[PDB]
Short mmCIF file of C-alpha atoms in Angstrom, two decimals:
data_model
loop_
_atom_site.label_atom_id
_atom_site.label_comp_id
_atom_site.label_asym_id
_atom_site.label_seq_id
_atom_site.Cartn_x
_atom_site.Cartn_y
_atom_site.Cartn_z
CA UNK A 1 67.30 69.55 89.21
CA UNK A 2 66.66 69.41 85.95
CA UNK A 3 68.53 72.37 84.29
CA UNK A 4 67.28 73.51 81.27
CA UNK A 5 69.90 74.99 79.01
CA UNK A 6 68.40 76.96 75.78
CA UNK A 7 70.33 77.58 72.99
CA UNK A 8 71.14 80.71 71.70
CA UNK A 9 70.91 83.14 74.41
CA UNK A 10 70.50 85.49 71.96
CA UNK A 11 69.06 84.99 68.37
CA UNK A 12 69.35 87.73 65.86
CA UNK A 13 66.69 87.45 63.36
CA UNK A 14 65.38 89.18 60.28
CA UNK A 15 61.78 89.98 60.36
CA UNK A 16 59.70 86.91 58.61
CA UNK A 17 62.21 84.41 58.52
CA UNK A 18 62.18 80.96 60.67
CA UNK A 19 63.77 81.06 63.95
CA UNK A 20 64.44 77.98 65.97
CA UNK A 21 65.44 77.71 69.73
CA UNK A 22 66.79 74.63 71.34
CA UNK A 23 66.30 73.78 75.01
CA UNK A 24 67.71 70.60 76.14
CA UNK A 25 67.31 69.10 79.80
CA UNK A 26 70.05 67.78 82.13
CA UNK A 27 67.59 64.67 82.29
CA UNK A 28 64.53 63.23 80.34
CA UNK A 29 61.57 65.28 81.25
CA UNK A 30 59.08 62.47 80.44
CA UNK A 31 56.76 62.35 83.04
CA UNK A 32 56.11 58.89 84.46
CA UNK A 33 52.52 59.08 82.66
CA UNK A 34 54.62 59.18 79.73
CA UNK A 35 53.58 62.94 78.93
CA UNK A 36 56.31 65.37 78.55
CA UNK A 37 55.74 68.56 80.48
CA UNK A 38 57.75 70.92 78.09
CA UNK A 39 56.36 74.46 78.09
CA UNK A 40 57.54 77.70 76.26
CA UNK A 41 56.79 81.09 77.51
CA UNK A 42 57.45 84.17 75.72
CA UNK A 43 57.80 87.18 77.68
CA UNK A 44 58.07 90.60 76.57
CA UNK A 45 59.62 93.39 78.39
CA UNK A 46 57.94 94.58 81.24
CA UNK A 47 54.98 92.13 80.83
CA UNK A 48 54.14 88.69 82.48
CA UNK A 49 55.38 85.73 80.51
CA UNK A 50 52.98 84.25 78.40
CA UNK A 51 52.27 80.76 77.40
CA UNK A 52 52.67 79.60 74.22
CA UNK A 53 53.48 75.59 73.85
CA UNK A 54 52.25 72.94 76.25
CA UNK A 55 53.56 69.36 76.31
CA UNK A 56 56.02 70.07 73.84
CA UNK A 57 54.33 70.52 70.96
CA UNK A 58 50.83 72.02 71.66
CA UNK A 59 49.91 75.24 71.14
CA UNK A 60 47.73 77.47 74.04
CA UNK A 61 44.65 78.51 72.54
CA UNK A 62 45.37 82.18 70.76
CA UNK A 63 48.89 81.54 69.77
CA UNK A 64 49.42 81.57 66.08
CA UNK A 65 50.02 78.23 63.87
CA UNK A 66 53.79 80.18 62.86
CA UNK A 67 54.79 78.51 66.54
CA UNK A 68 55.83 75.12 66.88
CA UNK A 69 57.45 72.81 69.13
CA UNK A 70 59.06 69.62 68.91
CA UNK A 71 61.30 67.07 70.67
CA UNK A 72 61.48 64.69 72.97
CA UNK A 73 63.18 63.30 75.68
CA UNK A 74 65.60 65.85 76.59
CA UNK A 75 65.87 67.89 73.32
CA UNK A 76 63.05 70.55 72.45
CA UNK A 77 62.80 72.75 69.56
CA UNK A 78 61.20 75.76 69.51
CA UNK A 79 60.16 77.10 65.70
CA UNK A 80 58.60 80.10 64.87
CA UNK A 81 58.34 79.87 60.75
CA UNK A 82 58.07 83.53 60.65
CA UNK A 83 59.20 85.91 63.06
CA UNK A 84 56.82 88.96 63.38
CA UNK A 85 57.79 91.91 65.27
CA UNK A 86 55.50 91.05 67.97
CA UNK A 87 57.30 87.86 68.49
CA UNK A 88 60.65 89.66 69.55
CA UNK A 89 60.99 89.17 73.36
CA UNK A 90 62.34 86.53 75.43
CA UNK A 91 61.19 83.04 75.20
CA UNK A 92 61.65 80.38 78.11
CA UNK A 93 61.40 76.55 77.60
CA UNK A 94 59.89 74.99 80.97
CA UNK A 95 60.08 72.11 82.63
CA UNK A 96 56.89 70.93 84.58
CA UNK A 97 57.85 67.14 85.06
CA UNK A 98 59.75 67.58 87.87
CA UNK A 99 60.65 69.49 91.08
CA UNK A 100 61.90 72.01 91.23
CA UNK A 101 60.21 73.07 88.59
CA UNK A 102 62.96 74.73 86.29
CA UNK A 103 63.12 77.26 83.32
CA UNK A 104 65.72 77.45 80.76
CA UNK A 105 68.01 81.16 81.05
CA UNK A 106 65.70 82.25 78.23
CA UNK A 107 66.66 83.01 74.65
CA UNK A 108 65.89 86.65 73.48
CA UNK A 109 65.00 87.35 69.92
CA UNK A 110 66.79 90.18 68.65
CA UNK A 111 66.86 92.25 65.44
CA UNK A 112 69.43 91.42 62.90
CA UNK A 113 71.11 93.84 60.91
CA UNK A 114 74.67 94.81 59.59
CA UNK A 115 77.61 94.67 61.92
CA UNK A 116 78.16 98.52 63.01
CA UNK A 117 81.01 99.04 64.88
CA UNK A 118 80.65 101.52 67.66
CA UNK A 119 81.23 105.23 67.84
CA UNK A 120 83.32 105.56 70.50
CA UNK A 121 83.34 108.81 72.81
CA UNK A 122 85.44 109.38 76.13
CA UNK A 123 84.61 112.37 78.48
CA UNK A 124 86.74 113.82 81.04
CA UNK A 125 85.16 114.52 84.55
CA UNK A 126 82.92 117.52 84.43
CA UNK A 127 84.23 120.57 87.01
CA UNK A 128 81.36 120.36 88.39
CA UNK A 129 81.62 117.01 89.85
CA UNK A 130 85.86 117.65 90.60
CA UNK A 131 84.38 120.06 93.07
CA UNK A 132 82.27 117.62 94.94
CA UNK A 133 85.57 115.73 94.97
CA UNK A 134 84.51 112.79 92.66
CA UNK A 135 85.70 112.02 89.23
CA UNK A 136 83.62 109.46 86.43
CA UNK A 137 85.24 109.51 83.39
CA UNK A 138 82.69 108.25 80.94
CA UNK A 139 82.82 106.56 77.77
CA UNK A 140 80.19 105.84 75.35
CA UNK A 141 79.85 103.46 72.89
CA UNK A 142 77.10 103.97 70.57
CA UNK A 143 75.19 102.34 68.11
CA UNK A 144 76.91 99.17 67.50
CA UNK A 145 75.89 95.40 66.31
CA UNK A 146 76.38 92.89 67.18
CA UNK A 147 76.12 93.50 70.96
CA UNK A 148 78.98 91.43 71.96
CA UNK A 149 81.49 94.34 72.93
CA UNK A 150 84.27 94.13 75.41
CA UNK A 151 85.19 97.94 77.10
CA UNK A 152 88.53 98.07 78.97
CA UNK A 153 89.98 100.95 80.83
CA UNK A 154 93.43 101.78 81.33
CA UNK A 155 94.91 104.24 83.05
CA UNK A 156 98.49 105.09 82.51
CA UNK A 157 98.45 102.35 80.13
CA UNK A 158 97.45 100.09 82.99
CA UNK A 159 94.23 98.07 82.84
CA UNK A 160 91.77 99.15 85.62
CA UNK A 161 88.84 97.11 86.21
CA UNK A 162 87.82 98.66 89.67
CA UNK A 163 85.23 101.21 89.70
CA UNK A 164 84.03 100.63 86.41
CA UNK A 165 80.10 100.31 85.76
CA UNK A 166 78.95 99.33 82.66
CA UNK A 167 75.23 99.72 81.14
CA UNK A 168 73.74 98.51 78.01
CA UNK A 169 70.74 99.74 76.28
CA UNK A 170 68.33 97.14 74.85
CA UNK A 171 68.65 96.83 71.25
CA UNK A 172 67.45 100.31 69.87
CA UNK A 173 63.91 99.97 67.83
CA UNK A 174 65.06 102.50 65.08
CA UNK A 175 68.13 101.41 64.07
CA UNK A 176 68.50 97.97 65.82
CA UNK A 177 72.25 98.96 67.53
CA UNK A 178 73.34 98.49 70.95
CA UNK A 179 74.81 100.97 73.00
CA UNK A 180 76.83 101.03 76.22
CA UNK A 181 78.10 103.55 78.55
CA UNK A 182 81.06 102.49 80.54
CA UNK A 183 82.15 104.61 83.77
CA UNK A 184 84.85 104.55 85.35
CA UNK A 185 84.52 106.40 88.99
CA UNK A 186 87.71 107.58 90.73
CA UNK A 187 87.71 110.14 93.36
CA UNK A 188 89.08 113.07 92.53
CA UNK A 189 92.48 112.53 94.29
CA UNK A 190 92.80 109.47 92.24
CA UNK A 191 91.94 111.19 89.36
CA UNK A 192 94.48 113.57 89.73
CA UNK A 193 97.24 111.05 90.34
CA UNK A 194 97.00 109.80 86.76
CA UNK A 195 97.65 111.39 83.07
CA UNK A 196 96.04 109.04 80.44
CA UNK A 197 92.65 107.98 80.19
CA UNK A 198 92.09 104.86 78.01
CA UNK A 199 88.51 103.40 77.09
CA UNK A 200 89.39 100.44 74.82
CA UNK A 201 86.50 98.51 73.03
CA UNK A 202 86.67 95.47 71.55
CA UNK A 203 83.93 94.60 68.95
CA UNK A 204 83.56 92.04 66.18
CA UNK A 205 83.83 95.16 63.62
CA UNK A 206 87.54 95.21 64.15
CA UNK A 207 90.83 93.18 64.30
CA UNK A 208 91.73 95.85 66.89
CA UNK A 209 90.60 97.29 69.79
CA UNK A 210 88.84 101.08 69.23
CA UNK A 211 90.64 103.58 71.57
CA UNK A 212 89.93 106.61 72.83
CA UNK A 213 91.73 108.62 75.16
CA UNK A 214 92.63 111.88 76.93
CA UNK A 215 95.10 113.45 79.10
CA UNK A 216 94.24 114.89 81.93
CA UNK A 217 96.48 117.66 81.40
CA UNK A 218 95.26 118.20 78.14
CA UNK A 219 92.17 120.16 76.79
CA UNK B 1 38.18 87.95 83.33
CA UNK B 2 40.39 85.55 85.03
CA UNK B 3 42.61 87.99 86.67
CA UNK B 4 45.15 87.34 88.99
CA UNK B 5 45.72 90.73 90.93
CA UNK B 6 49.15 91.16 92.56
CA UNK B 7 50.08 94.07 94.97
CA UNK B 8 52.06 96.89 94.38
CA UNK B 9 55.99 97.57 94.48
CA UNK B 10 57.37 97.38 97.29
CA UNK B 11 60.45 99.82 98.44
CA UNK B 12 61.80 97.79 102.02
CA UNK B 13 65.13 98.23 103.73
CA UNK B 14 67.48 95.41 104.15
CA UNK B 15 66.73 92.96 106.39
CA UNK B 16 62.90 93.73 106.32
CA UNK B 17 60.08 91.52 105.31
CA UNK B 18 57.34 92.34 102.64
CA UNK B 19 54.00 90.61 102.04
CA UNK B 20 53.28 90.41 98.59
CA UNK B 21 49.78 88.98 97.47
CA UNK B 22 47.98 87.45 94.44
CA UNK B 23 44.47 88.03 94.30
CA UNK B 24 42.41 85.75 92.31
CA UNK B 25 39.32 86.47 90.43
CA UNK B 26 37.17 84.77 87.65
CA UNK B 27 37.70 81.40 88.38
CA UNK B 28 37.23 78.78 91.50
CA UNK B 29 39.89 79.61 93.54
CA UNK B 30 40.23 76.41 95.23
CA UNK B 31 40.85 74.14 91.60
CA UNK B 32 44.36 76.05 90.81
CA UNK B 33 47.68 76.26 92.86
CA UNK B 34 49.06 79.42 92.53
CA UNK B 35 52.72 79.21 91.72
CA UNK B 36 54.84 82.40 92.67
CA UNK B 37 58.09 82.97 90.71
CA UNK B 38 61.01 85.32 90.73
CA UNK B 39 62.74 86.92 88.14
CA UNK B 40 66.22 89.13 88.57
CA UNK B 41 66.39 91.64 86.64
CA UNK B 42 68.22 90.62 82.92
CA UNK B 43 67.97 87.01 84.37
CA UNK B 44 65.24 83.89 83.92
CA UNK B 45 62.17 82.73 86.16
CA UNK B 46 62.77 80.76 89.06
CA UNK B 47 60.31 78.77 90.69
CA UNK B 48 59.53 79.79 94.34
CA UNK B 49 56.70 77.43 95.25
CA UNK B 50 53.19 76.55 95.03
CA UNK B 51 50.07 77.40 97.44
CA UNK B 52 47.31 75.57 97.67
CA UNK B 53 45.20 74.77 100.98
CA UNK B 54 46.47 72.04 102.45
CA UNK B 55 49.67 71.61 99.84
CA UNK B 56 52.37 74.25 99.82
CA UNK B 57 55.40 73.38 98.02
CA UNK B 58 58.56 75.31 98.08
CA UNK B 59 61.73 74.97 95.68
CA UNK B 60 64.48 74.33 98.46
CA UNK B 61 66.10 77.46 97.24
CA UNK B 62 63.36 79.71 98.64
CA UNK B 63 62.66 77.29 101.76
CA UNK B 64 63.70 79.89 104.16
CA UNK B 65 63.11 83.19 102.64
CA UNK B 66 59.62 82.87 101.25
CA UNK B 67 56.20 81.78 103.22
CA UNK B 68 53.42 81.02 101.04
CA UNK B 69 49.64 81.20 102.66
CA UNK B 70 46.47 81.08 101.23
CA UNK B 71 43.22 82.55 102.55
CA UNK B 72 40.46 81.05 100.66
CA UNK B 73 37.92 82.87 101.79
CA UNK B 74 38.91 86.11 99.98
CA UNK B 75 40.81 83.91 97.01
CA UNK B 76 44.15 85.68 97.70
CA UNK B 77 47.28 83.85 98.25
CA UNK B 78 50.42 85.51 99.80
CA UNK B 79 54.14 85.28 99.94
CA UNK B 80 56.07 86.67 102.67
CA UNK B 81 59.66 86.94 101.94
CA UNK B 82 62.01 87.81 104.98
CA UNK B 83 65.24 89.09 105.57
CA UNK B 84 65.61 90.80 102.62
CA UNK B 85 68.52 91.64 100.92
CA UNK B 86 69.33 93.29 97.69
CA UNK B 87 69.56 90.12 96.07
CA UNK B 88 65.95 89.79 96.53
CA UNK B 89 65.72 92.79 94.29
CA UNK B 90 63.18 90.91 91.50
CA UNK B 91 60.25 91.26 89.93
CA UNK B 92 57.45 88.34 91.81
CA UNK B 93 55.12 86.69 89.51
CA UNK B 94 52.34 84.22 90.56
CA UNK B 95 50.45 82.31 88.51
CA UNK B 96 47.63 79.47 88.34
CA UNK B 97 48.28 76.06 87.76
CA UNK B 98 45.76 73.20 87.57
CA UNK B 99 45.95 69.19 86.67
CA UNK B 100 46.22 68.91 82.76
CA UNK B 101 47.52 72.71 82.79
CA UNK B 102 50.17 74.83 82.91
CA UNK B 103 50.80 78.60 83.62
CA UNK B 104 47.94 80.26 81.63
CA UNK B 105 47.35 83.58 83.74
CA UNK B 106 49.87 85.54 85.48
CA UNK B 107 49.84 88.70 87.95
CA UNK B 108 51.55 91.27 86.07
CA UNK B 109 54.35 91.04 88.57
CA UNK B 110 55.35 93.37 91.66
CA UNK B 111 58.53 94.46 91.80
CA UNK B 112 60.63 94.49 94.91
CA UNK B 113 63.73 96.87 95.94
CA UNK B 114 65.70 96.37 98.69
CA UNK B 115 67.63 99.37 99.84
CA UNK B 116 68.04 101.44 102.54
CA UNK B 117 68.54 104.99 100.58
CA UNK B 118 66.98 107.76 101.35
CA UNK B 119 64.98 109.27 98.53
CA UNK B 120 67.95 111.81 96.84
CA UNK B 121 68.23 114.05 94.08
CA UNK B 122 70.49 113.15 91.22
CA UNK B 123 73.40 115.18 90.52
CA UNK B 124 73.40 115.98 87.07
CA UNK B 125 76.93 116.51 85.32
CA UNK B 126 77.26 117.58 81.83
CA UNK B 127 79.56 115.84 79.79
CA UNK B 128 80.96 117.80 77.05
CA UNK B 129 84.18 116.80 75.00
CA UNK B 130 87.78 117.20 75.62
CA UNK B 131 88.17 119.10 72.72
CA UNK B 132 89.61 116.88 70.17
CA UNK B 133 86.06 116.02 69.93
CA UNK B 134 85.61 119.45 67.92
CA UNK B 135 86.10 117.81 64.48
CA UNK B 136 83.77 115.65 63.07
CA UNK B 137 80.43 116.04 61.39
CA UNK B 138 78.71 114.68 64.65
CA UNK B 139 79.74 115.66 68.67
CA UNK B 140 78.78 113.38 71.14
CA UNK B 141 77.27 115.07 74.39
CA UNK B 142 76.11 113.36 77.60
CA UNK B 143 74.72 114.04 80.97
CA UNK B 144 75.78 111.95 83.81
CA UNK B 145 73.06 111.38 86.61
CA UNK B 146 74.63 110.38 89.73
CA UNK B 147 73.28 109.10 93.05
CA UNK B 148 69.87 109.49 93.03
CA UNK B 149 67.46 107.33 94.59
CA UNK B 150 64.98 105.98 93.64
CA UNK B 151 64.22 105.16 89.96
CA UNK B 152 62.89 106.15 87.89
CA UNK B 153 64.89 109.48 86.48
CA UNK B 154 63.52 111.13 83.02
CA UNK B 155 66.20 112.76 80.86
CA UNK B 156 65.37 114.64 77.56
CA UNK B 157 67.30 116.70 75.86
CA UNK B 158 66.37 120.42 74.88
CA UNK B 159 62.99 119.63 76.41
CA UNK B 160 62.35 116.78 74.32
CA UNK B 161 63.15 118.83 70.76
CA UNK B 162 66.48 116.38 70.73
CA UNK B 163 64.94 112.91 70.37
CA UNK B 164 66.90 111.81 67.98
CA UNK B 165 70.52 110.77 68.34
CA UNK B 166 69.62 110.10 71.85
CA UNK B 167 70.89 106.88 74.52
CA UNK B 168 69.58 106.92 77.89
CA UNK B 169 71.44 104.31 79.18
CA UNK B 170 69.71 101.82 82.15
CA UNK B 171 70.66 102.96 85.89
CA UNK B 172 72.80 101.03 87.59
CA UNK B 173 73.79 100.95 91.85
CA UNK B 174 76.71 102.86 92.89
CA UNK B 175 77.08 102.67 96.84
CA UNK B 176 73.49 102.15 96.80
CA UNK B 177 72.38 105.11 94.49
CA UNK B 178 71.52 105.02 91.04
CA UNK B 179 73.29 106.44 88.37
CA UNK B 180 72.67 106.90 84.71
CA UNK B 181 73.97 108.72 81.78
CA UNK B 182 72.65 109.83 78.53
CA UNK B 183 74.30 110.85 75.15
CA UNK B 184 73.07 112.90 72.63
CA UNK B 185 74.82 112.99 69.06
CA UNK B 186 74.21 116.42 67.25
CA UNK B 187 76.13 118.02 64.15
CA UNK B 188 78.78 119.92 64.94
CA UNK B 189 76.81 122.31 63.45
CA UNK B 190 74.64 122.69 65.96
CA UNK B 191 76.75 122.94 69.30
CA UNK B 192 78.40 124.82 70.74
CA UNK B 193 76.82 127.13 68.68
CA UNK B 194 73.11 126.40 69.75
CA UNK B 195 72.31 125.44 73.41
CA UNK B 196 72.16 121.42 74.32
CA UNK B 197 70.84 120.97 77.41
CA UNK B 198 69.93 117.94 79.40
CA UNK B 199 66.48 118.10 81.50
CA UNK B 200 66.79 115.40 84.16
CA UNK B 201 63.56 114.83 86.12
CA UNK B 202 63.43 112.60 89.22
CA UNK B 203 59.64 112.39 90.54
CA UNK B 204 60.61 110.91 93.54
CA UNK B 205 62.18 114.23 94.90
CA UNK B 206 60.39 116.63 92.83
CA UNK B 207 63.35 117.67 91.11
CA UNK B 208 64.17 118.63 88.22
CA UNK B 209 67.89 119.87 86.75
CA UNK B 210 67.80 121.48 83.53
CA UNK B 211 72.03 120.99 82.79
CA UNK B 212 73.17 123.13 79.57
CA UNK B 213 76.20 121.38 78.26
CA UNK B 214 79.08 123.92 77.77
CA UNK B 215 82.00 123.38 75.90
CA UNK B 216 85.25 122.46 78.87
#
């Protein structure tokens, strides 16, 4: 199959400035007829993809002239001369020269903003949950930027990976930050066999992880 | 009005098969191929195959999973997906294509969820700080909404009054059931002096839970 590699996978942009997204194919997508059936689609959350550009550089009807495509052979670019709010979404390049038809993995256009360290909160299990025999320890890592973050749970100083579930918000429309929840779920019995619970967040905004913890035998 | 109208969302049990339709209107049905595409959540589009009368092509990856049929009389095509698993949880799109053109019109997508879960209301657990968080300008509270099915759940705080500082996280699957959390950050002034409650509604079970967040 022709693998379609898009770069970057996430492209922070400021409104009004230009954005370029690259799509490279693992082989030439010049068809035998000499056309290059490289297309770009934009998908907004919850909506069908929309055709932007076909045959490398042609705008589909209704696509404003701020979108242009270029490239040849295996290297293709979609350029947006002036990003507008409505352009935020996921862009996919697509090749229709070869079967199977293949798409790139998508480049999400996101809003750039200043870096923001996460506000990290850790929560011991509620007493209610403990009564049910479960113990979820929750760590919120709120309002950070950029989106790349690594969370690590430590229980009595040892990394714990099983039972961890993370969820990430999309970029906040108000402040362009991201938030994440990380929940470590244990049985009440396992929970009660450990003392210290630590949510550790590594984010570009500090050189050292942000550490929140609590001791079960404290309050 | 060219339109591709797909069938509605499906919740089916593992092992079951589902038949999703894509009805075409406003153009000459036999002038276009219908292509089907999968998009798993948070991932890209994958081509499944096309269906056209006398020409059905599958992506090798889907050859054993999908069967495409076309009913030209009614200008509808179908994708049958068999022996479903949660790996098949996806939105499926149809789109049309013809020579010299591209995927210009698309169906709205059909979401498939494969689960053996029964409708289960959420357990809602208040998340109050362990009380070293009793010092900053802002306090963050949360509600853990655990063990529900199906989606969605709606979370509000103080019945929508607290709109600012709220983060409701996408649900994740944890033993066939969804878990979601929501956080709200409020001024230390306002909690615990004022009540804060997360209001969780789960329409599928007609259940609402209003959990007051009280200090531990």
